[PDB]
Every structure is written in C-alpha cells, then in structure tokens.
C-alpha cells in the first residue's frame, strides 16, 4: 500500500479536526497507508520543516502539506522532501518555478469568497436605503481575502462597519474583544471568525444581550454549527473541511496509481442558516461526533 504522509499546521480546532477526519476516512476507503503529523501550531515553522523531513525518512510515496506559512518552503521544499510529490491542502503553498516541480495537486478554497458570502448575507438583509445598520469586525490576526470579499459584498448596502478589532485567533482573546463590542452598545451584528462567534454566543447570553446583537461567522465549526442549529447564530459559510481532506487524499492516491484527477480541486462554498442545515452539506464539512483525532 502506498504511503501518504499528511502534515497540518496544527490539529487543535473544529476545522482541522474535520479536515483530519476526511483525510483519515478517505485514506481508508482509498486503501492507502496514512500517517498524519501536526506542527505545534502556525508559529512552529521549524517543527514543520523537520516533520516534512521526517515524512521523507519514513519513506512517504506522497506528501500532503498544510503550510504553516504560504511563503515558507518557497525556495527550499526539495531540501526537505527531496524529490517526493507534494499536494497542498487548505492553505496556499506557493513555490518558485524551480520548486514548483513537486506540486502534483492543490485542494483549497478562495477565502475571499468565504467573507463575501457572509457579506452577501448581511447585504440582502439590509439593502441600500432600508436603514443604516452597524457592524463589528472580529476577523482575527492582522489585505486579507476574508476581509476584502466581505467589503466587496457590503459595497452599496446600507450596512456600516463601525469599528474593526484584530487579535490572535484564541478564544480568550476574541472573547475580550466581543466584550469590548458589547460595551459600545450601538452595534447590531458581529461578523467574526468561528472562534469569535463561539465566544460571542456565551458572552451575549451572559450579558443577556441575545436578541440584540446578531452573529455572523466567516467560516464553520462545531459550535458555530451547533450555534446555528439552536438559532444562536444567523449565518455561516462552509468550505467543506471534511471534503477538502478527502479530495487531497484522492489526488495523492490517483497520482501514484496513475489515474485522472483535478490538479486544482476545490469544494464549493455553501451558505448556512439555521433553517437550511442540509445533512449531506454538513457531513462534508464537520467530523462526526465522538470521532477522535486519528493519525493512521
């Protein structure tokens, strides 16, 4: 059986836990020998470099890689994996023409469209001249696709972005910001990352301000999902985290087995609202309950 060694930036959130599930699931169905490795977290550049090297020593026939930083490995990939085939996942892995030799496939989604979708939700909710509406923007770390797309969908929409707060994507950090927003009390919606919306759900209950501030997530996760299911969230787009995981394994398997496969696959973003959670749509986004992180 072909050996495929996947490598994530980390595996501590709903997202990558879900990508993992698909990668592990397909890896089974696809009948290949999987081995997954997770860096300490996005700031762990060194760690991932060694993991890439470790994947090679393991004798990986193919390597799926979720970059910890786009421009990393741009001029070094071969000095880590050698001549092994690499397939990018979730994150954009750009390499120089000399290094682009290894890129046998890419699975991902343009996050501009993720923010756009969230933007569009709000825009149709409040068209031009229907009445000024105030927004808060907790999108995380410091141009950004999610942001750009959100702005483009707002253009000409009677929706006003009062303030915008950034901070790492940690729960306790976002929670803090969410509270900061609740205090300026003239806002009607909080467009933020899944972790921020998650925080806002509790913070808004605690402050009893539920029904007073709407929550719009810029992406999906268990929690933001369960939040939707229980009308504690208004909207969230899904970029099929589970599916992205499968696709990547499929690419890698097909390539090695000399089969046809889209060199640049990408699931189809889908909007989610409480009354529109379609089973088959979430089955390709979030890992099943009880499912725990698997590494082979």
């Amino acid at each position: 059986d072909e050996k495929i060694c996947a490598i994530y930036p980390h595996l501590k959130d709903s997202y990558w836990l879900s990508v993992n599930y698909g990668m592990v699931s397909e890896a089974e169905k696809q009948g290949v020998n999987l081995r997954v490795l997770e860096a300490g977290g996005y700031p762990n550049k060194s760690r991932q470099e060694q993991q890439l090297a470790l994947c090679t020593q393991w004798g990986a026939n193919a390597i799926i890689l979720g970059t910890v930083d786009p421009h990393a490995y741009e001029h070094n990939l071969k000095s880590w994996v050698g001549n092994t085939p690499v397939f990018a996942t979730v994150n954009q892995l750009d390499l120089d023409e000399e290094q682009s030799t290894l890129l046998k496939g890419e699975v991902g989604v343009d996050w501009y469209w993720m923010g756009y979708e969230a933007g569009k939700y709000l825009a149709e909710r409040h068209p031009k001249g229907s009445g000024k509406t105030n927004i808060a923007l907790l999108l995380g770390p410091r141009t950004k696709p999610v942001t750009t797309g959100f702005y483009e969908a707002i253009k000409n929409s009677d929706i006003h972005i009062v303030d915008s707060f950034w901070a790492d994507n940690d729960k306790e950090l976002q929670r803090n910001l969410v509270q900061r927003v609740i205090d300026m009390g003239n806002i009607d919606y909080i467009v933020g990352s899944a972790v921020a919306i998650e925080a806002a759900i509790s913070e808004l209950r605690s402050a009893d301000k539920t029904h007073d501030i709407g929550l719009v997530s810029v992406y999906l996760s268990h929690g933001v999902y369960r939040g939707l299911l229980r009308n504690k969230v208004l909207f969230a787009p899904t970029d099929k985290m589970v599916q992205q995981g499968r696709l990547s394994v499929m690419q890698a398997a097909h390539y090695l087995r000399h089969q046809p496969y889209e060199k640049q696959a990408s699931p189809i973003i889908k909007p989610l609202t409480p009354k529109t959670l379609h089973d088959d749509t979430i089955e390709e986004s979030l890992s099943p309950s009880e499912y725990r992180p698997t590494f082979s």
């Binding site: 760690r47 996760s221 309950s289 082979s296």
Partner: protein, 270 residues
Amino acid sequence: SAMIEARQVSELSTRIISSVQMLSNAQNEQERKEAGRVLFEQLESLLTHIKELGGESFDSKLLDALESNVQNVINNLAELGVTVERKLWLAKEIDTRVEEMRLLSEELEQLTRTQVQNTSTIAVANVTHIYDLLEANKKDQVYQALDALVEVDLDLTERLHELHLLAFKMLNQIEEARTLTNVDRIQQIQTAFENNLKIMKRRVLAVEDPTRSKQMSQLLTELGKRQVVFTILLQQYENNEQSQQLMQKTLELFSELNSTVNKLVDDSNK
C-alpha cells in the same frame, strides 16, 4: 642588588594577582586567551627576577624553600587557569543541553494543550448530537449519551487539564534551569523534575489514546535522558566554588613566596 630584585618581585606579585582575578572573571574564549596571555608574560618576568635574586644567596635551606614556593605559585595559576577553561565549557554545555530539553518540553506542553483543545470541540460535537437524538424521541440513546458526556468527556476534560498542568510545570522548570546558579535550588528542581517526570510518565500511559500516548511516552523518555543536565548544572557550581578557593590560595602562596624572598634578601647582608 638583592633589594633591587626583591621589590621587583613584590611589585610583579601584585600585578600577577590582579591578572588572575581578571582571568577568573573572563567570559568568552577570548577574554580568557587574553587576561591569561598577559598573566603568562607577567609570570616569565617574576621568574627572571626570582632567578637573579636566586644568586644573591647560597643557603641550602632557603634556596630550596624558594624553588618550592615558586612552583606552588606556578601550579596554582595553572590549576586556576584550567578552571576558568573548564568553566567556559560547562556554560557552553549547559546552555546547549538545556535548549535541547526546552524544545522537547515545549513540544510536550503544546501536545497536551492540543489535546485539551480537542476534548472541548468533541464535547460540543457530542452535545450537538444529543439534540438530534432528542428530536427523534430516541429517549434511550439520549440517556446513554448523557452518561457518556459525564463518564467520558467531562472526566477526560479534567484528566487532560491536570496532565497539561504538569507539562506546563515541567517546562517552567527547564526555563529556570539554564540560569540556575544557586546550588540548593538546583538540588530542588532536579528532584522535582525527576518526580514530576515520573508521575507524568504514568499518567500518559493510562490515557486511552494510541498515537498520542506513544508520542508523549517518547517525549518523556527523551527528556528523562537529558535529565543529567542537572548534574552538570552542579559541576558548574562545584567548579565556580573551586575557582574561588584557588584565588584565595593564590594570595597565601604569594604571601608565602615573599615571606621567603625577604628572608632571602638578607644573607646577602652577611
């Protein structure tokens, strides 16, 4: 002419001492190469003079007691110059060996945090599932689900927080170890690190989670090995102790040397 050299010796004696002190408080393998290289030249002079003065008398008892006092003074500066040499090495070793341990301990802290993280997500996923079971009025499976929520999730969430707390402590220790000069604290942290490591090693083995338990047991056995960094952390101290006693010895030897170059400046007055 014997007084011409005696004072010359007493004079160079002082400049030598202030050169050994300087040698002592040297830091890189350069300030060492220097404060010592001049310590050398200053010595080759204390010798030319101690030699000439060695002619102004022929008392068997004194000429030998002089030959002796000069050697002792030489072996001392020697043993001391080696100590300052060994010091620079220990610092190089410790600083190196510690960082090695840090990278590991840090990996383990993140690996346990990562697990605490997952348990939450899953608890939430697990509760979401109950909403479905509840809808379909599958009341049995609901009871069963709530059971698991407690007997498994809420219970794991605690066990993992506890584990992550240890890995956190174990890291804080390695961070303090690299600048540990105090012997008693080195003593304390060493056995604390050893005890913690042990319970940690046991707590992980019981955690029902394949890949993760191996990962951690590995990291743990690996850290367990670099545990010796503590012994060498002592040698650091043990050696700096030496380096200080030697310095105090240098004074007694130079005092003794002159207390003899003087008894010698006489006899040329007979």
